[PDB]
Model the fold of this input.
Amino acid sequence: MTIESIRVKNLLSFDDVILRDFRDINCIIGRNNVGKSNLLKVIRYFYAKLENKKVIPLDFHTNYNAVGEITFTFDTTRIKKIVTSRKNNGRFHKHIYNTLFKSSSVKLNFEELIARKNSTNKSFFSLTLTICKDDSVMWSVDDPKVRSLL
Amino acid sequence: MTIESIRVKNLLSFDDVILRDFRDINCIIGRNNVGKSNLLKVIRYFYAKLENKKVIPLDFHTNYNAVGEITFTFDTTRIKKIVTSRKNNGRFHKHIYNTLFKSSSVKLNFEELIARKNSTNKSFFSLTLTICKDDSVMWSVDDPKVRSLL
Amino acid sequence: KMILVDKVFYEKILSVESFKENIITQSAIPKISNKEVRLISSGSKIFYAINNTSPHSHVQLRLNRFFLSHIPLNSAAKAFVRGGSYLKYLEPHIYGSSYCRLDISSFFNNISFDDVKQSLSPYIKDEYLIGTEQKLIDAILNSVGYESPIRKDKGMIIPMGFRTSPAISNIVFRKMDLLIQDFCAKKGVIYSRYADDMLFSNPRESKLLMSDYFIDEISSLLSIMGFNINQSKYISREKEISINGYVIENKGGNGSIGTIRLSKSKLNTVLKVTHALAQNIPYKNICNKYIKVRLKEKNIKYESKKDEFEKKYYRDQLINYLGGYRSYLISLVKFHSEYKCVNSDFIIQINGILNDIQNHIQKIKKNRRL
Amino acid sequence: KMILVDKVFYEKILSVESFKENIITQSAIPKISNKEVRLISSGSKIFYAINNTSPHSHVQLRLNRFFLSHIPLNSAAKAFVRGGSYLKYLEPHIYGSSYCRLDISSFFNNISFDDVKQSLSPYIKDEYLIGTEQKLIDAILNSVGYESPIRKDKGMIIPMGFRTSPAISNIVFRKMDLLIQDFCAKKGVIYSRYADDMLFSNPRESKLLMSDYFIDEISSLLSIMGFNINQSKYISREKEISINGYVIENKGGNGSIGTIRLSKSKLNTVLKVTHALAQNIPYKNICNKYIKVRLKEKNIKYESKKDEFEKKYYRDQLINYLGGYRSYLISLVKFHSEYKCVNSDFIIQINGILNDIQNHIQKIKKNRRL
RNA sequence: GAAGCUGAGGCCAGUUUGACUGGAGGUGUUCGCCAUCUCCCUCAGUAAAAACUAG
DNA sequence: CAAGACCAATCTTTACACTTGAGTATTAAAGTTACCTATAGCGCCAAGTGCGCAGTTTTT
DNA sequence: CAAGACCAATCTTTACACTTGAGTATTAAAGTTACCTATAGCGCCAAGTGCGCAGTTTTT
RNA sequence: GAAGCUGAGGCCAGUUUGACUGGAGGUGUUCGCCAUCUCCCUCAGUAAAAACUAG
Done:
């Protein structure tokens, strides 16, 4: 897969919405703009803030919360299979390992590293964008290199 | 007068610019867009944030400062003369006094109130908009009624 | 549209018949007297129970049903709210790498009635209910409030065990929910609250939740409305926390998702019960030894039959317990299936335990007919 | 474009001729030895002065002129910066209603040389200046650094009185300038700094600057690079503050502009000098009693004439003092005219004082020719 | 360990049989020598940066 | 004593290596960078024109 | 013990009063608000269809 | 004053000539009874809300 989940909390017309189990073709139907255009706006805003574009923050569904969160879970299993292999010693694979997969495999010990390698594992990378009440934006990963690579 | 001063610190192409002594006709000349359009953008942004419009924050002149400030000094001498008089007991004059001129005359004692009344005084109201590094905006006066009335 | 209860709303929908006499005779609705309130003692805690026959119970229940349920709340409050649960209270912290857990000392006893009046005032019309003697808001507060005879110093007190105490606590604490949520979010910390138990998690790599500064700041925020932090229950840990049995673990760093499982302490009682049922030790011993449920002789409804009555009651208690624990574990399973945050090996263990429970329940229901 | 000094830059523009021998012979540039440094004692403070004849003085002066002046700084640093002044350090606080003033204990003595190297590293190329023995950055730090023979424990130390110490202090403290500026601005407080003296002002109506929390937070921020707050110089006040003579006052609340004046303590010496000059007390007594300037007998340049020399020297000292104080007061007047923040009655008093000073200066210059 | 801070002495006043502490008053005040009005000598030693030379 | 919050650049943008479709241990070359600067009042020297290198306040 | 940070609405938008151009002590009417709701499983009663009002875990 | 917290008793073990403290072990660990693997009785008294009835 490519995207495991998208979660929006307290933004536009979304109270707490989680979308997952994405298939190869996703057909969106229903009454017009009851959240279709809102979901599109959420995704576009997240991907505009990913590339450090200065875009206006989204509105809150209810002002009785201080923040609104958009969480994207990327499925990086295939990229881990791409880079962890010995053959591909290229610069791009090396950079991808140093950025996305390090600082998560460093903490592990030998036994857990072996268990992760040998098992039919699935690897995920979760990135959360939080909008505070005063228009500030906070990421759950503070490295801009990670955001640009994603 | 109407506006006593406009001060911009660390925004767009402005390092620390103070404009004052405004006359009835102000002619702006010089090399094109060396700060003309930037001054217009600053004024438009301040007046859009005054009315609680969601507009994009301005860029910093240099990122070695945490904030950029726009200070507007309004000349409210005539409005004080308008409202402090006894004859005009209308609702609008009463609201203007309760919003703009109270909380600044309450602290005063009788002698200083008399001195302010009798002297050929000039009254000013200073409002500062501060943009932090994380796009947040802070006002030097936290009452939205003051901003809307201004 | 914000809810607004006025005199007609109280007369028709809320009072109905409970206070018809007091509203037609223009007599002030009185305080909840000590006669209507019984005082149970549970350890060091004291619980206040109102009699159902009193009109105060009816008006309180209808107040919960129609008025308190419509006032908006903060999303960080996961307790006593429509759709909230403990698992929902733990879920947002799977993304965190360090965990901190704080408690509020005597949450319900420290809720000042003045704060309750200030919180409920905008949602109640400023009218006079009875002539010019008693206000509508004061009558409703009479419905919700109480004076503890044990402690007359505080006067008005919101007691535990009433109909309306939890929801009123949530509404009055929405202010601190907002303040703490704003502070934590500006610090990058995920915050959630269940009753008086606050959980914070930092997903980044930092010692913020371990410093005394964080505790000092949360105490400073709580001090605005007079609350205090229970320092005996303050917990701070890295990479895993065992909160009252529920274990959250997240070893990874950037972009890692933790797992929520149950420690062996939680599973201890149910595993022992299943083993005892496999051991064919009688139902009376199973109920008494592990579940602490028993049929007191003074609680026998009828003297027509005793031994068969006790056998049926113990069988009912066992079937009820097994159904309840099965329901709890499927609550966990559904939470996993909808959020995908529970450990996979723990999921397998849960499935095995569930199959064992269902086999035992089938055996019990089959032996019922023999 | 960020400045970048490389080997050719050091050889041509900086070293010039001061270290020609050391650069052609490939011999390492040596530390500033104790022979080149004299130690003056001013109260409890010790000042380090390098001899002008040493090449270290020349390279330090050219380092100030060409390299340190190009590295960007933070706008909150109003000291030792092109265009900065004390009045500019006080000005942004006229809008504040409460004031707080903090000091850093031994600012220059607590500047670790490791922090200096880390700060200056990105602006200096990572090359080898002399073979593979000494690096360019290490040679420049040799130029700027020193080891105090009084305190050998700290090794490298930036001493007061050197050519490059103030600018290097500003560059190394830019990090804390940014951190404190961000914190104060997120709290709504106007912050400015002059050397080690930090001034904060809150324009809103709040007790933030008076609580111990603010001092604790500023101390916590300063602790990152090892600084400490001088608790003897901590000041907090409302509606006016008298900072070292300069008085800021702002009684009003929402949208009020304060006034900066000078207390009578600052004007005391100049008023007394003007009164003494009007009293026709001789110039020697005026210089000795109030100004503490005197001509020591060992400082007589030539023995050809003494009494006329002493009269001319005292007249020169008096004319210089009057010109200097007049210059200070017109600095105040220009600051007012450009910012409009000085008290009007104080402006009138300044004008009268200035006219008196000019009349006295004209009288002195006229009596010179008699 | 919390440093508080100041250069070394020679009269005179206040506290001491024999040495230590200050050398306009008024007024208000956040009590800070903080603000505002009016009216002791000697000898050392004194680094650097920055602003300012009314209009 | 003791600690969370430990600048912003540093040239920038794009990007697979191996044997042609799948792959289980750690950045970089390259096109553009892409253009910079000696020496401002004082001293040396031709010898009074022209060229080379004794203040205030605040921190303290 | 002790404190800075003490929600977000509450209907909303516009706006001079006095005698027609200048003025030295404290909000509001009004048009739209502008539309809302009794009573969800259990008990009473017609008497088995229809109408009115003995669990788990967590806080504790 | 910092409360720490628990319902009241009746054996047996450990500390006490006469009354007080616990009733699987292993392993690791942030040492928290915290996590993971394997395998004492009686009598009181027990308010409210919320989730959950696999698939």
Q: What stands out?
A: The two ends of chain C are 60 Å apart (CA to CA). Residues 246 and 262 of chain C are 5 Å apart (CA to CA). Chain C is about 45% helix and 15% strand.
